[PDB]
Design a protein around this ligand. Structure first.
Ligand SMILES: COc1ccc(C2=N[C@@H](c3ccc(Cl)cc3)[C@@H](c3ccc(Cl)cc3)N2C(=O)N2CCNC(=O)C2)c(OC(C)C)c1
Length: 96
């Protein structure tokens, strides 16, 4: 079965965050240094909620500037409805 052969070792697709991103995930309660991409997105959401980086009046807006997360994103702000900076950052900071 060639489909099985292809998918062996790549059915979970674990990643290792680079050290600055790993520090953010730990701050959100993550343990260890290997995650699924879904786990990474969970801990990033949780980080923004516990650091109170979102706008109470406009909850889709994150004000990450002068936080480590804003350094990693290269942004002062982003809307979750326009998440291009997050895609760019995870492309750069998640190692298979
Ligand atoms: C209307 O208010 C919303 C609507 C959606 C989100 C959101 N949307 C989810 C989401 C957004 C973009 C992508 Cl690419 C993936 C997931 C996910 C999330 C995950 C990682 C990051 Cl860095 C930011 C947000 N994510 C969340 O983390 N949410 C889900 C809903 N409410 C929450 O308390 C947490 C949201 O996130 C805050 C953390 C800003 C606020």
């Amino acid at each position: 079965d060639l489909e099985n052969l292809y998918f062996q070792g790549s059915q979970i697709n674990q990643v290792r965050p680079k050290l600055p991103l790993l520090k953010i995930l730990h701050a959100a309660g993550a343990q260890g240094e290997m995650f699924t991409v879904k786990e990474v997105m969970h801990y990033l959401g949780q980080y923004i909620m516990v650091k109170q980086l979102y706008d109470q009046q406009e909850q889709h807006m994150v004000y990450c500037g002068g936080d480590l997360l804003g350094e990693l994103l290269g942004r002062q702000s982003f809307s979750v409805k326009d998440p291009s900076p997050l895609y760019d950052m995870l492309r750069k900071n998640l190692v298979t």
